[PDB]
Amino acid sequence: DVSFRLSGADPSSYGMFIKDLRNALPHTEKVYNIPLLLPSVSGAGRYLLMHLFNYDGNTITVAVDVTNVYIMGYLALTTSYFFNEPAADLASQYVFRSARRKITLPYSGNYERLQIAAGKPREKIPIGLPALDTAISTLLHYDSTAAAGALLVLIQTTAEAARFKYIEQQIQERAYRDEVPSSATISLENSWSGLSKQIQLAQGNNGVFRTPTVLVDSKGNRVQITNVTSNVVTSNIQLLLNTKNI
Ligand SMILES: *[C@@H]1O[C@H](CO)[C@@H](O)[C@H](O)[C@H]1NC(C)=O
Ligand SMILES: Nc1ncnc2[nH]cnc12
Missing domain, CATH: 4.10.470.10 (Ricin (A Subunit), domain 2)
Incomplete structure (x- = not known):
């Protein structure tokens, strides 16, 4: 697992988290000196768990597919949330099994559906470490519209940065x-x-x-x-x- 804490975060600790996130993705080959993600990975091993903590120290765990860096879902307290798409439904077989309930979000995880759900394109959504802190907070309490915006922030500040x-x-x-x-x-x-x-x-x-x-x-x-x-x-x-x- 990899971890990031917004409390006391600075460019350096964020750079360390992004380095940890990259280093958690398996590869057997570099192409032009760039790690080549695997064709596939079987079982629970396909999914990295990122533990994110907002400034007050509350946490969500995010499940990421190690073959394509795609966020599939997340756990907040005892509720799991997964995108409405087959790959996430498969992921739900492997991660956050001990959640008391599982909610399927009313959209898939691609940028086009997320932007529709959020009511704005990501050209108009501010991002940064404060926005990430907000996004973690938002995801702690289910609101599907607000969640879309938070997920746009979360995807860009983790996966896209990696x-x-x-x-x-x-x-x-x-x-x-x-x-x-x-x-x-x-x-x-x-x-x-x-x-x-x-x-x-x-x-x-x-x-x-x-x-x-x-x-x-x-x-x-x-x-x-x-x-x-x-x-x-x-x-x-x-x-x-x-x-x-x-
Ligand atoms: C490759 O890319 C550069 C631009 O980055 C270009 O100026 C150059 O002529 C190209 N070289 C070849 C072999 O295509
Ligand atoms: N769910 C997701 N995870 C990572 N990158 C993405 N780009 C668009 N959607 C994404």
Whole structure:
């Protein structure tokens, strides 16, 4: 299991949590020096438990699929919550079995359904360490609309930060003040699968992507990523979704 405490959190302790989260994901291979997530994992071993504590020290446990970094559900006091999608229903067979009741949330876990549920796109949802503290608090008491927004915050500040060093840095910049994600952040979130696939196909194609990936950069500019010498590949992406899962 991996843990993070919002109480006394700073950029350093958050960086340590994101390092722990990455290190908990199993790999047998690096591709271009980036850990390659596994095709699959059987049984309870598929699911990492992240213990998160809000500033008052209350806790939720979040279940994450170690093959794709996907949050499937969470436990808050004695109630488990899972997304309404087959992968989460499978996860519910393995995690939080001792919960007194299990609620299936009225949406799946993808960004499009979550944003509909929350009534806003994540371009308009501030993120950062204070927003994460809020999100943990919200999830402690079931409110499906409020929960969607909290889950958008929670996904971006954990899974998306583990996937991309740039996103981890964005959150570190937001240690004491929330701010909506940069469009570069949004771009990366949306491209992880695409990048993961192209970095794997570059192997046996002399490091050249079969299909270029279009991103937005820091200054807000729309760039084409065509080969593994890109900074996005060398110094940003931290984990690769296995093409067997794409
Ligand atoms: C690869 O990417 C860079 C941009 O990052 C580009 O300028 C360069 O010409 C490309 N190299 C190859 C071999 O395609
Ligand atoms: N439930 C989830 N977990 C991790 N990353 C995601 N991106 C969109 N939905 C997600």
